[PDB]
């Protein structure tokens, strides 16, 4: 049978991209069999790491390899042999938050609803296998093309004050470190708020320590200027203090699809 894995020689490291949880991340170029140049991010794991952290590094690779969803970031390959490389597709358009900020003056509300729906579909898939993501935010969404966004890597806290994203988190996550598909629904609605606000930071007017007090009073993020009122109602249902009262992602996909079709039609007239 033909060689399955990526050969290490087909991946050239060009520069440091940054420091990740398990080790350094490099920018590189992967050359496929057709000779095409594919820009990649190469995640590495420190050789000195505990075999537990080495296992978890591989576990995340295995999940990303198998998800294979149009709205989740693509894994290109795994080179298991040390030094272990996780080869991810690199997206030149970059993060969604910055993309929205630079394109604010040309972006239509239709497109913001589309991105929300695309991420919602990714989340419905994760919900179907009870897989909790914990980092659904515009800084962790990549723009594959103007037509397609992709949810990024799982939240680091699964691995396991840690600089938690307090301003995006459900009250049960903040208060009791509970992370469930329902706390993902809360976070997703914060992500929608970011999208429909062209990348504003949620609760930008508060310090992290102020956030839970505000939520307990029943205060919530305000309606973004260009947010369709129907979508704000959807967000408010996602921000129910009671996780059991929040919509499931399956329900949200139906709701968002309806809104998308409605906005497309309203737009013509
Ligand atoms: Mg209730």
Coordinates of C-alpha atoms and ligand atoms in Angstrom, one line a residue:
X1 CA 0.0 0.0 0.0
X2 CA 1.1 3.6 -0.7
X3 CA 2.7 5.7 2.0
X4 CA -0.1 7.3 4.0
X5 CA 1.4 10.0 6.2
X6 CA 2.9 13.3 5.2
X7 CA 6.7 13.0 4.8
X8 CA 8.7 15.4 6.9
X9 CA 10.7 16.4 3.9
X10 CA 7.5 17.7 2.2
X11 CA 7.1 20.3 5.0
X12 CA 9.5 23.3 5.1
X13 CA 9.6 25.5 8.2
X14 CA 10.0 29.2 7.3
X15 CA 9.6 31.1 10.6
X16 CA 8.2 31.1 14.1
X17 CA 4.5 31.8 14.2
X18 CA 4.3 31.8 18.0
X19 CA 4.2 29.9 21.3
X20 CA 1.3 27.4 21.7
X21 CA 0.2 25.4 24.8
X22 CA 2.3 22.3 24.1
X23 CA 5.3 24.0 22.3
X24 CA 6.4 26.3 19.6
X25 CA 4.3 26.8 16.4
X26 CA 6.1 27.4 13.0
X27 CA 4.8 28.8 9.7
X28 CA 5.7 26.5 6.9
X29 CA 5.0 25.2 3.4
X30 CA 3.7 21.7 2.6
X31 CA 4.3 20.5 -0.9
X32 CA 1.7 17.9 -2.0
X33 CA 2.0 15.1 -4.6
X34 CA 0.6 17.4 -7.3
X35 CA 3.5 19.8 -6.4
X36 CA 1.2 22.5 -5.0
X37 CA 2.4 24.8 -2.2
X38 CA 0.1 24.8 0.8
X39 CA 0.8 27.2 3.6
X40 CA 0.7 25.5 7.0
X41 CA 1.1 26.0 10.7
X42 CA 3.2 23.3 12.3
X43 CA 2.5 22.7 16.0
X44 CA 5.2 21.0 18.0
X45 CA 5.4 19.5 21.5
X46 CA 8.4 19.9 23.8
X47 CA 10.4 16.6 23.9
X48 CA 10.7 17.2 27.7
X49 CA 7.0 17.4 28.3
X50 CA 5.2 14.9 30.6
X51 CA 4.0 11.9 28.7
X52 CA 0.5 13.0 29.8
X53 CA 0.9 16.3 28.0
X54 CA 2.4 14.4 25.0
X55 CA -0.8 12.2 25.1
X56 CA -3.1 15.2 25.2
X57 CA -1.2 16.9 22.4
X58 CA -1.8 13.8 20.3
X59 CA -5.4 13.5 21.5
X60 CA -6.2 17.1 20.2
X61 CA -4.5 16.2 16.9
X62 CA -6.6 13.1 16.6
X63 CA -9.9 15.0 17.2
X64 CA -9.0 17.7 14.7
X65 CA -7.9 15.1 12.1
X66 CA -11.3 13.3 12.4
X67 CA -13.7 16.2 12.6
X68 CA -13.3 17.0 8.8
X69 CA -16.1 19.7 8.9
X70 CA -16.3 22.6 6.4
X71 CA -16.5 25.1 9.3
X72 CA -13.8 23.7 11.5
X73 CA -10.1 24.4 10.8
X74 CA -8.5 21.7 8.7
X75 CA -5.7 19.4 9.8
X76 CA -3.4 18.5 6.9
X77 CA -1.4 15.7 8.6
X78 CA 0.4 14.3 11.6
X79 CA 4.0 13.3 11.7
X80 CA 4.1 11.2 14.9
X81 CA 7.8 10.4 14.8
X82 CA 9.7 12.8 17.1
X83 CA 9.9 15.7 16.8
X84 CA 6.1 15.3 16.5
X85 CA 4.6 17.8 14.0
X86 CA 0.8 18.6 13.8
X87 CA 0.4 20.1 10.4
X88 CA -2.6 22.6 10.2
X89 CA -3.9 24.5 7.2
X90 CA -2.9 28.2 7.4
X91 CA -5.6 30.7 6.4
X92 CA -4.1 33.9 4.8
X93 CA -7.2 36.0 5.5
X94 CA -6.5 35.5 9.2
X95 CA -8.8 35.8 12.3
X96 CA -12.5 36.7 11.9
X97 CA -12.4 39.6 14.4
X98 CA -9.7 41.5 12.6
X99 CA -11.3 40.6 9.2
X100 CA -14.6 42.2 10.4
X101 CA -12.8 45.3 11.7
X102 CA -11.0 46.0 8.4
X103 CA -14.1 45.2 6.3
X104 CA -16.8 46.9 8.4
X105 CA -17.6 49.6 5.8
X106 CA -18.3 47.1 3.1
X107 CA -19.8 44.1 5.0
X108 CA -23.5 43.4 4.7
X109 CA -25.6 42.0 7.5
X110 CA -26.4 39.0 5.4
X111 CA -22.8 37.9 5.5
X112 CA -22.6 38.4 9.3
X113 CA -25.7 36.1 9.7
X114 CA -24.0 33.5 7.3
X115 CA -20.8 33.4 9.4
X116 CA -23.0 32.9 12.6
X117 CA -24.8 30.1 10.8
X118 CA -21.6 28.4 9.6
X119 CA -20.1 28.4 13.1
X120 CA -23.5 27.2 14.5
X121 CA -23.4 24.2 12.1
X122 CA -19.9 23.3 13.4
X123 CA -21.2 23.5 16.9
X124 CA -24.2 21.3 16.2
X125 CA -21.8 18.6 15.0
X126 CA -19.7 18.9 18.2
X127 CA -22.9 18.9 20.3
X128 CA -24.0 15.6 18.6
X129 CA -21.0 13.9 20.1
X130 CA -21.1 15.8 23.4
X131 CA -17.8 17.5 22.6
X132 CA -17.3 20.7 24.5
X133 CA -15.3 23.4 22.7
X134 CA -14.8 26.3 25.2
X135 CA -13.2 28.8 22.7
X136 CA -16.0 30.1 20.4
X137 CA -14.9 33.6 19.8
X138 CA -14.0 35.7 16.8
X139 CA -10.3 35.7 17.6
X140 CA -10.5 31.9 17.4
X141 CA -12.4 31.8 14.0
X142 CA -10.4 31.8 10.8
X143 CA -11.5 33.2 7.5
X144 CA -10.8 30.6 4.8
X145 CA -12.5 32.8 2.2
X146 CA -15.1 35.6 2.3
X147 CA -17.6 32.8 1.8
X148 CA -16.4 30.5 4.5
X149 CA -15.3 30.8 8.1
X150 CA -13.8 28.0 10.3
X151 CA -13.9 27.4 14.1
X152 CA -10.4 27.1 15.5
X153 CA -8.7 24.9 18.2
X154 CA -10.5 23.7 21.3
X155 CA -10.1 25.8 24.5
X156 CA -6.8 25.1 26.3
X157 CA -8.5 24.5 29.7
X158 CA -9.4 21.0 28.7
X159 CA -5.7 19.9 28.9
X160 CA -6.3 20.8 31.7
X161 CA -6.7 32.5 37.2
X162 CA -5.4 31.0 33.9
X163 CA -6.3 34.0 31.8
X164 CA -9.7 32.5 31.3
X165 CA -12.0 34.3 28.7
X166 CA -14.3 35.6 31.5
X167 CA -16.1 38.0 29.2
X168 CA -17.3 35.2 26.9
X169 CA -18.1 32.6 29.6
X170 CA -21.3 31.2 31.1
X171 CA -22.0 32.0 34.8
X172 CA -21.7 28.2 35.6
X173 CA -18.3 28.2 33.9
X174 CA -17.1 31.3 35.8
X175 CA -18.6 30.2 39.2
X176 CA -18.2 26.4 39.1
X177 CA -15.8 25.6 36.3
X178 CA -18.7 23.7 34.5
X179 CA -18.2 23.3 30.7
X180 CA -21.0 21.7 28.9
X181 CA -22.7 21.9 25.4
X182 CA -25.0 24.5 27.1
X183 CA -22.1 26.7 28.3
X184 CA -20.9 26.5 24.7
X185 CA -24.3 27.8 23.6
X186 CA -23.8 30.8 25.9
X187 CA -20.4 31.4 24.5
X188 CA -21.6 31.0 20.9
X189 CA -24.2 33.8 21.5
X190 CA -21.3 36.0 22.8
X191 CA -19.5 35.1 19.5
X192 CA -22.6 36.1 17.5
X193 CA -22.6 39.4 19.4
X194 CA -19.0 39.9 18.4
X195 CA -19.7 39.1 14.7
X196 CA -22.8 41.5 14.6
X197 CA -20.6 44.1 16.3
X198 CA -17.8 43.9 13.7
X199 CA -15.4 42.4 16.2
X200 CA -16.0 44.5 19.4
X201 CA -14.9 42.9 22.6
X202 CA -17.8 41.8 24.8
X203 CA -18.1 43.8 28.0
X204 CA -15.2 46.1 26.8
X205 CA -16.4 48.6 29.4
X206 CA -15.9 46.2 32.3
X207 CA -13.0 44.7 34.1
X208 CA -13.1 40.8 34.3
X209 CA -13.9 40.9 38.0
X210 CA -17.1 43.0 37.4
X211 CA -18.6 40.6 34.9
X212 CA -20.3 38.0 37.1
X213 CA -22.0 40.7 39.3
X214 CA -23.5 42.3 36.1
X215 CA -24.8 38.9 34.9
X216 CA -26.4 38.1 38.2
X217 CA -28.3 41.3 38.2
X218 CA -29.7 40.2 34.8
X219 CA -27.8 42.7 32.7
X220 CA -26.6 41.4 29.3
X221 CA -24.7 42.6 26.3
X222 CA -26.7 45.3 24.5
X223 CA -28.2 44.9 20.9
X224 CA -25.5 45.6 18.3
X225 CA -26.6 48.5 16.1
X226 CA -27.0 46.3 13.0
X227 CA -28.2 43.2 14.7
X228 CA -31.6 41.9 13.4
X229 CA -33.9 42.1 16.4
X230 CA -34.8 38.3 15.9
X231 CA -31.1 37.5 16.4
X232 CA -30.9 39.5 19.6
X233 CA -33.8 37.6 21.0
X234 CA -32.0 34.4 20.0
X235 CA -28.9 35.7 21.9
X236 CA -30.9 36.5 25.0
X237 CA -32.3 33.0 25.1
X238 CA -28.7 31.7 24.9
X239 CA -27.9 33.8 27.9
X240 CA -30.5 32.3 30.2
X241 CA -28.8 31.9 33.5
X242 CA -30.3 28.4 33.6
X243 CA -28.3 26.2 31.2
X244 CA -31.3 23.8 30.8
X245 CA -33.4 26.7 29.3
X246 CA -30.9 27.6 26.6
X247 CA -31.5 26.5 23.1
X248 CA -29.5 23.5 21.8
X249 CA -27.3 24.0 18.7
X250 CA -29.7 21.9 16.6
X251 CA -32.4 24.4 17.4
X252 CA -30.1 27.4 16.7
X253 CA -29.2 26.0 13.3
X254 CA -32.9 25.9 12.4
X255 CA -33.4 29.4 13.8
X256 CA -30.4 30.9 12.0
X257 CA -31.2 29.2 8.7
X258 CA -34.7 30.8 8.8
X259 CA -33.2 34.3 9.6
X260 CA -30.6 33.9 6.9
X261 CA -33.3 33.1 4.3
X262 CA -35.4 35.9 5.6
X263 CA -32.6 38.5 5.4
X264 CA -31.7 37.3 1.9
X265 CA -35.3 37.9 0.7
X266 CA -35.9 41.2 2.6
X267 CA -32.6 42.4 1.0
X268 CA -34.0 42.0 -2.6
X269 CA -37.0 44.3 -1.8
Ligands
LIG1 MG1 -35.7 29.8 33.5

